[PDB]
Design a binder for these strands. Structure first.
Ligand code: CMP
Ligand code: CMP
Lengths: 200, 200
DNA sequence: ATTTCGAAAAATGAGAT
DNA sequence: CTAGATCTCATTTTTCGAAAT
DNA sequence: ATTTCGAAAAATGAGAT
DNA sequence: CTAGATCTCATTTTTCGAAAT
């Protein structure tokens, strides 16, 4: 499209190898990122180092957008590379300028912020309203919504570990394992290792 | 300041009494809200009617924006008045106009969004990494800092039910009652009825 | 506005499970 | 194993409308 | 350099508390 | 109550960098 080609123009693209950290919590922020290629995982930790995945951000998604509206803001989370990422970087000071001339670019940003809020909100609900099974069924549907989600005649096909699912719903790897089978025993999903198939 | 009075100048003011419903989750968004005076409660329900309090919004806070970025969108949650409010309402299409005769108004709304995401994200953390005592402990401290709290000789004072408190930390009223008594045993607060004093 | 007075509606705890 | 969830009524606390200050 | 392969590692399955 | 967390061990799957092609 128009504007987005112009934006990237003034961005300083960089490379990040999968599993490398792109953003640190507590970090002072002055940089707005943009994922041109690759995918990351937005995540937070408890005082024990334990970690929860807040979301996954793929291509065309903005990163570290939060510290852009107030002075002295710190990164609210970590943002790790899941695959090899190709991300465009630009300072807050500069980005704010790209808006002056064409506020259509902030409209793209705001729209994405809006969406995240809906999902993060829906997430808080699941957390209080559903049990691990409910939370797991839900997260499975969400994983089938991801771009790196392949296809299967039985439905959609994803690749992820019981370990990782637990960091998403906030339960144990055991609990996930117990429940995963329980779902397979009702032909709703086809589990076999690090691969899950959601019959849909 | 200008940007706002010029904003209101194009809005249609409405008044709602305490406890009335301003937004019904599920309905089609086509309107925007700005709380000129008073305060509201953002909340979600489950099929069984259980209610969860995502947030409290107050004077100067925008409402009903999540739908403003994409076509065919539904209100994400219910919004019910806490106190009597005087709200400014404007259409999406009428707002899309203003944003292009001064995008400074968009920047300002995006700013409130960014903040709600930090906050909602933090809520995700709490639910996962904290025991009910901790979350409740956390809530009182916050509520104690809400614009509608009352100064107290020994601290800040608030009026809220155990019921409601459980709708913010996600747990039953029974548990909020029990934990409440222990926080008093520890001379951390004094709870008489719905009035709770949070010792400075 | 708000302090009062009598319902009527809400919100609680107790302790068993 | 164990934080908490639930379920039940008998009991408080509040809320709400009308009335006066 | 890119591809094939057999340990260490990471991820799980089980069963008791 | 009772959904899930923890712990311990023993087995499977993956991850990966040495070696190979
Ligand atoms: N709930 C969320 N959903 C998606 N992305 C998020 C969420 N919370 C934080 N982030 C991203 O993680 C980044 C962490 O640093 P910033 O606060 O600068 O910007 C944040 C967002 O870009
Ligand atoms: N997590 C949240 N925090 C604060 N406000 C919210 C949250 N989720 C939804 N809202 C508000 O509630 C509104 C529900 O309908 P909309 O989606 O139009 O817009 C939403 C926001 O104005």
């Amino acid at each position: 499209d128009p504007t987005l080609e112009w934006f990237l123009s003034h961005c300083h693209i960089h490379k990040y190898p999968s599993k490398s950290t792109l953003i640190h919590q507590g970090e002072k922020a002055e940089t707005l990122y943009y994922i041109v290629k690759g995918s990351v995982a937005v995540l937070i930790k408890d005082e024990e180092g334990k970690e929860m995945i807040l979301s996954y951000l793929n291509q065309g998604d903005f990163i570290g957008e939060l510290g852009l509206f107030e002075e002295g803001q710190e990164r609210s989370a970590w943002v790790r590379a899941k695959t090899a990422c190709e991300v465009a970087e630009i300072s807050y000071k500069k980005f704010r300028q790209l808006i002056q001339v064409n506020p259509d670019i902030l409209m793209r940003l705001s729209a994405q912020m809006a969406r995240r809020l809906q999902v993060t909100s829906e997430k808080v609900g699941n957390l209080a309203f559903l049990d691990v099974t409910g939370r797991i069924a839900q997260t499975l549907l969400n994983l089938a919504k991801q771009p790196d989600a392949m296809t299967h005649p039985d439905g959609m096909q994803i690749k992820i570990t019981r370990q990782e699912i637990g960091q998403i719903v906030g339960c144990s790897r055991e609990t996930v394992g117990r429940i995963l089978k329980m779902l397979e025993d009702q032909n709703l999903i086809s589990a076999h290792g690090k691969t899950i198939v959601v019959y849909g």
